[PDB]
Amino acid sequence: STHTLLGQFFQGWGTWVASWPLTILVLSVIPVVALAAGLVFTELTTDPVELWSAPNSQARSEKAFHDQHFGPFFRTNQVILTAPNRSSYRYDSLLLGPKNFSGILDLDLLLELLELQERLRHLQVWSPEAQRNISLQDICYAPLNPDNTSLYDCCINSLLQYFQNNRTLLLLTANQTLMGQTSQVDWKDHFLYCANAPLTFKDGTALALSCMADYGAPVFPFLAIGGYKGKDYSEAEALIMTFSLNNYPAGDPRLAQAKLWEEAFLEEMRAFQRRMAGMFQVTFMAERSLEDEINRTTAEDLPIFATSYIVIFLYISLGLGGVAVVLGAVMAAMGFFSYLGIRSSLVILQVVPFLVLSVGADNIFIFVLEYQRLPRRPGEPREVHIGRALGRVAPSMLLCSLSEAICFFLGALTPMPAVRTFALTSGLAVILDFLLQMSAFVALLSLDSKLLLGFFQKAYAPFLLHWITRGVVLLLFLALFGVSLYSMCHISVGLDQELALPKDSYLLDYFLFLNRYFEVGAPVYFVTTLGYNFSSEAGMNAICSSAGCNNFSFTQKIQYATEFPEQSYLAIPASSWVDDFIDWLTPSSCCRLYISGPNKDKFCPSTVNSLNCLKNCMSITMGSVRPSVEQFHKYLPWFLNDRPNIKCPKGGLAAYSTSVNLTSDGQVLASRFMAYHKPLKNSQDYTEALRAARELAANITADLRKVPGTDPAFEVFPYTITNVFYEQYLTILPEGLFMLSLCLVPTFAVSCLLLGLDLRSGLLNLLSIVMILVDTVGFMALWGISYNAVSLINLVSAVGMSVEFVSHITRSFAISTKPTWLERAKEATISMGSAVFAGVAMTNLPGILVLGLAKAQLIQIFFFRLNLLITLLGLLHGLVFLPVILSYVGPDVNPAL
Numbered sequence: 001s002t003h004t005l006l007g008q009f010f011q012g013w014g015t016w017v018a019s020w021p022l023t024i025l026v027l028s029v030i031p032v033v034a035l036a037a038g039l040v041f042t043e044l045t046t047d048p049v050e051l052w053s054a055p056n057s058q059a060r061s062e063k064a065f066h067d068q069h070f071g072p073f074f075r076t077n078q079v080i081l082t083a084p085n086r087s088s089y090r091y092d093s094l095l096l097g098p099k100n101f102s103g104i105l106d107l108d109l110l111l112e113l114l115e116l117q118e119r120l121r122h123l124q125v126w127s128p129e130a131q132r133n134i135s136l137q138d139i140c141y142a143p144l145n146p147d148n149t150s151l152y153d154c155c156i157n158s159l160l161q162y163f164q165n166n167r168t169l170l171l172l173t174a175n176q177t178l179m180g181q182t183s184q185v186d187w188k189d190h191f192l193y194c195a196n197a198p199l200t201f202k203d204g205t206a207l208a209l210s211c212m213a214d215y216g217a218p219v220f221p222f223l224a225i226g227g228y229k230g231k232d233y234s235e236a237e238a239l240i241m242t243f244s245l246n247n248y249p250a251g252d253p254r255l256a257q258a259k260l261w262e263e264a265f266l267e268e269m270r271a272f273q274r275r276m277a278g279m280f281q282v283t284f285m286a287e288r289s290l291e292d293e294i295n296r297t298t299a300e301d302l303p304i305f306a307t308s309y310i311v312i313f314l315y316i317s318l319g320l321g322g323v324a325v326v327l328g329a330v331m332a333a334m335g336f337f338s339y340l341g342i343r344s345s346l347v348i349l350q351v352v353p354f355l356v357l358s359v360g361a362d363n364i365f366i367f368v369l370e371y372q373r374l375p376r377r378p379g380e381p382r383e384v385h386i387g388r389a390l391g392r393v394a395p396s397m398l399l400c401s402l403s404e405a406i407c408f409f410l411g412a413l414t415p416m417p418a419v420r421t422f423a424l425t426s427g428l429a430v431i432l433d434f435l436l437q438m439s440a441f442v443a444l445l446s447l448d449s450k451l452l453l454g455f456f457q458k459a460y461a462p463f464l465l466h467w468i469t470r471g472v473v474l475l476l477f478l479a480l481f482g483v484s485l486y487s488m489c490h491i492s493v494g495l496d497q498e499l500a501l502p503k504d505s506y507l508l509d510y511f512l513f514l515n516r517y518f519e520v521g522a523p524v525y526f527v528t529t530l531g532y533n534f535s536s537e538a539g540m541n542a543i544c545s546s547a548g549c550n551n552f553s554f555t556q557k558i559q560y561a562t563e564f565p566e567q568s569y570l571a572i573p574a575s576s577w578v579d580d581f582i583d584w585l586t587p588s589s590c591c592r593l594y595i596s597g598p599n600k601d602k603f604c605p606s607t608v609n610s611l612n613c614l615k616n617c618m619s620i621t622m623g624s625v626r627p628s629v630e631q632f633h634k635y636l637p638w639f640l641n642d643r644p645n646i647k648c649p650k651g652g653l654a655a656y657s658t659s660v661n662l663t664s665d666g667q668v669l670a671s672r673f674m675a676y677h678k679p680l681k682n683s684q685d686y687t688e689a690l691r692a693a694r695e696l697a698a699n700i701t702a703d704l705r706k707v708p709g710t711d712p713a714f715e716v717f718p719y720t721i722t723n724v725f726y727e728q729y730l731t732i733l734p735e736g737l738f739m740l741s742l743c744l745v746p747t748f749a750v751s752c753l754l755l756g757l758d759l760r761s762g763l764l765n766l767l768s769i770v771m772i773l774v775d776t777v778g779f780m781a782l783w784g785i786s787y788n789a790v791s792l793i794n795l796v797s798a799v800g801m802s803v804e805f806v807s808h809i810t811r812s813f814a815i816s817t818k819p820t821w822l823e824r825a826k827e828a829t830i831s832m833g834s835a836v837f838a839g840v841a842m843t844n845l846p847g848i849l850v851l852g853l854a855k856a857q858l859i860q861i862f863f864f865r866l867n868l869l870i871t872l873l874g875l876l877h878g879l880v881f882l883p884v885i886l887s888y889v890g891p892d893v894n895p896a897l
């Protein structure tokens with residue numbers, strides 16, 4: 001008899017608390033201030049976007065490997081222009097004939113872009129470190145000269161670097177004759193040539209200009225122009241400007257002083273946008289922007305949510321004290337984790353009370369209603385009266401605040417750190433609410449000494465409980481179940497990137513141009529783990545692509561997967577370094593040795609010419625030349641220090657200077673192979689591209705481990721900058737369904753174990769909760785709400801919350817001792833359904849009056865838009881179905897003396 005013992009215990013507890021209310025109130029209000037001091041002490045928040053990745057997941061372990069061996073990924077800042085007013089026209093270029101250009105490639109706009117680019121290059125900002133005024137050379141990603149980066153060696157990708165940013169070279173007209181000349185060649189004839197082959201040093205036109213940038217590296221067309229899918233390289237609808245800044249770990253001061261340059265870059269481009277509006281639509285984005293704009297919306301709406309926990313006060317209209325009790329409990333639970341050490345963000349800190357308070361106030365309302373509705377046996381004071389009232393309401397009030405702490409704690413197994421912190425914070429707020437609304441609230445309820453609901457509940461009852469009503473409500477809700485369980489399959493898993501922003505930020509314009517005008521997605525690298533030999537003649541051929549090497553190979557596998565971009569999510573070949581290194585070892589003035597030079601007997605660089613150096617590295621021509629082992633360690637570092645000029649453009653440190661990590665002897669440890677994704681638009685494309693690249697990587701490693709000298713536990717994994725975000729969605733269906741399905745067991749095993757309910761009433765309770773979950777999943781899929789990590793903690797919270805909808809109804813039916821089932825549930829409805837309705841409306845009205853006007857996309861889609869569905873879909877299953885279903889398959893009469 002576990003139910004009877006709890007009532008006796010809580011009745012004696014309530015009588016003693018009524019006896020000593022002042023002392024219990026002071027001694028239970030004093031241990032809240034100590035826990036609340038943890039908030040004011042530090043409460044360290046987590047600003048950046050590394051609160052959305054599992055700290056030991058495989059996708060972040062690969063990032064920790066790559067970041068260690070090759071340095072971190074470069075931060076990118078972009079500007080897109082896309083002039084829409086001008087008209088496409090015609091140009092009869094002498095080489096390729098007719099070409100019908102677009103309006104953005106007119107010469108009147110390129111100069112105006114150049115005067116913005118060369119002024120963004122010379123930008124200086126004052127830092128918190130007051131000594132040094134920061135230039136761009138300190139924090140720029142220079143792939144050719146990192147030792148002392150001059151200001152002209154920083155990576156500034158744009159179309160203007162086909163002319164090396166030279167104004168006079170851009171304004172150049174040259175006579176050229178093929179005997180049918182009829183014109184002079186202008187800059188566009190040179191741009192059309194450089195688009196086809198970016199590696200050329202001497203242009204094939206009459207005017208000669210290299211297609212290489214100011215820093216000695218080629219610039220590809222997809223990094224410069226976009227929106228050119230048909231009619232290639234002629235009808236670009238948008239220019240592109242890109243600045244690359246090298247990234248550091250979070251503790252380094254250079255990252256602190258490189259986020260201050262991007263702020264001035266944004267504040268200068270925002271002035272550039274309004275300086276000209278009749279000829280451009282410039283949209284920009286810095287890497288600082290996204291992680292410091294989703295915090296702005298959350299930090300600009302705390303006063304607009306302060307009406308939430310004051311509109312909690314007005315709906316009860318002894319009530320101020322209860323809301324103060326729940327707010328103190330939630331604040332203490334919020335501040336307790338600072339002592340243990342948990343870096344929670346302000347976004348987590350803003351929505352915790354507005355989901356715990358909606359469950360913490362209903363128990364107060366139920367207790368005060370049962371205290372003010374009791375028969376009030378005379379001959380005894382209130383000191384036993386409140387204990388007598390609390391004895392038969394304590395266990396039912398204990399189920400609904402213990403079947404939510406269990407649900408929230410069980411829901412804290414999600415991979416995301418911030419969702420885990422939100423679950424852990426609200427899992428202890430409610431459990432520190434139930435312990436503090438009897439040790440403090442009962443003292444106030446004894447210390448206070450010094451309608452119409454039951455009107456129309458008895459008219460709402462004849463609307464139900466009749467065969468007109470009891471035979472249509474059942475099949476209608478079963479049809480709702482039948483439509484929801486087949487609409488569940490249309491649900492879409494994945495969280496879009498644009499839902500973190502408001503409806504008015506410039507990043508929405510940037511993403512709308514990025515999804516529509518780019519032609520290559522983010523780059524990806526096929527990293528090679530430690531172990532591969534890379535030296536044997538039978539070792540290079542498995543990673544080769546040309547001149548005698550094998551039929552199928554790694555850099556041949558990537559190129560073959562490029563040709564079906566719809567299935568494999570790649571759009572550019574691999575560009576391996578062994579393929580370029582074998583080309584560089586070909587003779588004729590690339591790799592040469594001094595013969596009679598005692599002082600420089602090893603290397604003759606390409607730029608030096610004389611009659612001294614004449615011997616080649618590779619000895620004699622032969623079919624499919626490949627170096628020996630001893631010729632590898634000599635000749636590989638030299639290839640990583642030969643800048644490409646026009647005497648040997650075969651390769652060098654232009655693109656491979658940080659793609660191989662040499663040891664202290666000459667055995668390579670790891671490598672990278674850079675290939676570009678196809679244009680990825682929504683969040684169902686990122687995860688699918690991740691899976692379709694990872695399976696290709698596993699195919700490559702399974703093919704590559706067959707060589708003789710290799711080592712097992714050697715895998716070639718893919719890595720891109722956003723792999724650490726969308727890696728969870730491969731495995732959120734099995735780990736999401738399992739967490740929900742295991743979450744019903746501790747509620748079913750306790751709701752039928754606390755208050756009667758042997759099998760049938762608890763079974764109907766489980767049927768109601770499963771119906772609520774399937775209906776809310778179907779309506780969530782039908783609205784457009786996604787199914788991600790942040791939209792699963794809400795469903796777990798609804799599973800915890802629905803015990804409110806059902807437990808009091810099944811309680812009042814079980815205690816009912818009236819004769820027939822046709823009217824036995826009427827007393828239970830009139831007794832408890834009104835109180836449950838008031839409790840549900842207690843979350844319904846403040847659940848809509850604040851979170852529906854949040855102005856953030858995250859709160860407006862995942863907390864107002866979804867909690868409203870659960871709240872007004874649990875009313876229909878708790879006030880229209882459950883009493884009706886209990887009148888047909890309801891248990892027989894319990895005496896229950």
Ligand SMILES: *[C@@H]1O[C@H](CO)[C@@H](O[C@@H]2O[C@H](CO)[C@@H](O)[C@H](O[C@@H]3O[C@H](CO)[C@@H](O)[C@H](O)[C@H]3NC(C)=O)[C@H]2NC(C)=O)[C@H](O)[C@H]1NC(C)=O
Binds near residue numbers: 126132
């Ligand atoms: C870092 O930033 C500081 C401040 O912008 C900059 O100092 C600049 O020095 C030059 C040369 O003096 C000027 O642009 C200017 O210094 C003087 O400023 C006064 C007050 O407006 C002017 O009346 C003077 O014309 C001018 N110098 C003289 C006497 O001709 C100052 N910046 C401004 C415009 O206030 C540094 O150059 C930057 N980098 C560092 C630390 O070198």
Ligand SMILES: *[C@@H]1O[C@H](CO)[C@@H](O[C@@H]2O[C@H](CO)[C@@H](O)[C@H](O[C@@H]3O[C@H](CO)[C@@H](O)[C@H](O)[C@H]3NC(C)=O)[C@H]2NC(C)=O)[C@H](O)[C@H]1NC(C)=O
Binds near residue numbers: 535536
């Ligand atoms: C990568 O793969 C190469 C080729 O298989 C391998 O080179 C091998 O090194 C071992 C250890 O020194 C050598 O034993 C082996 O052949 C040796 O080559 C010298 C050259 O003058 C001969 O004089 C030796 O007799 C002979 N073996 C000895 C030392 O007695 C050599 N393979 C050949 C035939 O070139 C590398 O070790 C592999 N590297 C890694 C990272 O495992």
Ligand SMILES: *[C@@H]1O[C@H](CO)[C@@H](O[C@@H]2O[C@H](CO)[C@@H](O[C@@H]3O[C@H](CO)[C@@H](O)[C@H](O)[C@H]3NC(C)=O)[C@H](O)[C@H]2NC(C)=O)[C@H](O)[C@H]1NC(C)=O
Binds near residue numbers: 069070071661
């Ligand atoms: C090519 O590979 C090299 C070897 O893996 C890299 O050099 C390694 O850089 C690591 C940091 O990126 C270092 O790790 C830190 O080393 C210090 C000194 O021993 C330790 O105290 C730290 O615990 C450790 N990690 C930190 C910072 O917590 C390695 O020490 C260092 N070499 C090794 C493995 O000993 C190169 O960075 C990489 N490419 C180049 C040349 O940049």
Ligand SMILES: *[C@@H]1O[C@H](CO)[C@@H](O[C@@H]2O[C@H](CO)[C@@H](O[C@@H]3O[C@H](CO)[C@@H](O)[C@H](O)[C@H]3NC(C)=O)[C@H](O)[C@H]2NC(C)=O)[C@H](O)[C@H]1NC(C)=O
Binds near residue numbers: 166167168169
């Ligand atoms: C943008 O393009 C300009 C045009 O190419 C560059 O200016 C050119 O620089 C060349 C190298 O200094 C000049 O050659 C020199 O010209 C002078 C004066 O005519 C002669 O005395 C020299 O003999 C000759 N060089 C040598 C070493 O013999 C070109 O004359 C000059 N272009 C013209 C026609 O004015 C700019 O340098 C370039 N901008 C940048 C950033 O470099």
Ligand SMILES: O=C1[C@H](CC[C@H](O)c2ccc(F)cc2)[C@@H](c2ccc(O)cc2)N1c1ccc(F)cc1
Binds near residue numbers: 422497498501
């Ligand atoms: O920042 C952030 C968001 C998480 C912040 C925090 O973890 C949270 C959120 C809600 C809670 F209840 C409790 C904690 C998240 C994001 C979440 C919802 C969205 O509609 C959009 C983005 N994202 C992101 C950022 C970049 C990106 F590439 C993909 C996603």
Ligand SMILES: *[C@@H]1O[C@H](CO)[C@@H](O)[C@H](O[C@@H]2O[C@H](CO)[C@@H](O)[C@H](O)[C@H]2NC(C)=O)[C@H]1NC(C)=O
Binds near residue numbers: 175176183184
């Ligand atoms: C290209 O063609 C010839 C090749 O020598 C060259 O003379 C042109 O320059 C002259 O410019 C004149 C003024 O625009 C033009 O009318 C004339 O056709 C042309 N030379 C003559 C007399 O035929 C070169 N074109 C230009 C405009 O520089």
Ligand SMILES: CC(C)CCC[C@@H](C)[C@H]1CC[C@H]2[C@@H]3CC=C4C[C@@H](O)CC[C@]4(C)[C@H]3CC[C@]12C
Binds near residue numbers: 028
């Ligand atoms: C003569 C007797 C009654 C004196 C001893 C009374 C002791 C056992 C009582 C009096 C007040 C009580 C406290 C009142 C309030 C709280 C806050 C609650 O969140 C945890 C328990 C805690 C901290 C209680 C612990 C037990 C307590 C200290």
Ligand SMILES: CC(C)CCC[C@@H](C)[C@H]1CC[C@H]2[C@@H]3CC=C4C[C@@H](O)CC[C@]4(C)[C@H]3CC[C@]12C
Binds near residue numbers: 039040042044353
């Ligand atoms: C070193 C720095 C970060 C220390 C300063 C930490 C600051 C930002 C902390 C300390 C106390 C915090 C407050 C503590 C309590 C609450 C109530 C909660 O319902 C909303 C957030 C709010 C209002 C917090 C906002 C952030 C806050 C002001």
Ligand SMILES: CC(C)CCC[C@@H](C)[C@H]1CC[C@H]2[C@@H]3CC=C4C[C@@H](O)CC[C@]4(C)[C@H]3CC[C@]12C
Binds near residue numbers: 340341409424428
């Ligand atoms: C790096 C170190 C310091 C991290 C320590 C934090 C982690 C590992 C541990 C330390 C103490 C732990 C807490 C101890 C007690 C409780 C109360 C329980 O009802 C729910 C879990 C909860 C809230 C634990 C959560 C995990 C926790 C916060």
Ligand SMILES: CC(C)CCC[C@@H](C)[C@H]1CC[C@H]2[C@@H]3CC=C4C[C@@H](O)CC[C@]4(C)[C@H]3CC[C@]12C
Binds near residue numbers: 779782783869872
């Ligand atoms: C073509 C697409 C984009 C049109 C979408 C129209 C939107 C506004 C529609 C589609 C589905 C609709 C929902 C369908 C079901 C319910 C349950 C009901 O108890 C409250 C209203 C609510 C929650 C609806 C609100 C409006 C709604 C969200």
Ligand SMILES: *[C@@H]1O[C@H](CO)[C@@H](O)[C@H](O)[C@H]1NC(C)=O
Binds near residue numbers: 090091098099
């Ligand atoms: C393409 O070129 C032809 C001939 O110059 C021209 O008539 C046509 O208008 C051009 N294309 C577009 C989209 O206008």
Ligand SMILES: *[C@@H]1O[C@H](CO)[C@@H](O)[C@H](O)[C@H]1NC(C)=O
Binds near residue numbers: 147148149
């Ligand atoms: C600055 O750059 C030049 C470029 O050659 C280099 O020689 C010099 O060593 C660098 N300065 C220092 C102090 O290293």
Ligand SMILES: *[C@@H]1O[C@H](CO)[C@@H](O)[C@H](O)[C@H]1NC(C)=O
Binds near residue numbers: 084085279281
């Ligand atoms: C130029 O383009 C802007 C932006 O679309 C537009 O508002 C403006 O009317 C255009 N002006 C003209 C007439 O070219």
Ligand SMILES: *[C@@H]1O[C@H](CO)[C@@H](O)[C@H](O)[C@H]1NC(C)=O
Binds near residue numbers: 551
């Ligand atoms: C595959 O290798 C065989 C044997 O070297 C060769 O005959 C064949 O041409 C290669 N495959 C293709 C598609 O050429």
Ligand SMILES: *[C@@H]1O[C@H](CO)[C@@H](O)[C@H](O)[C@H]1NC(C)=O
Binds near residue numbers: 699702703
């Ligand atoms: C690579 O891919 C194809 C199709 O996925 C697969 O059938 C084949 O077995 C894989 N190659 C290897 C070496 O297993």
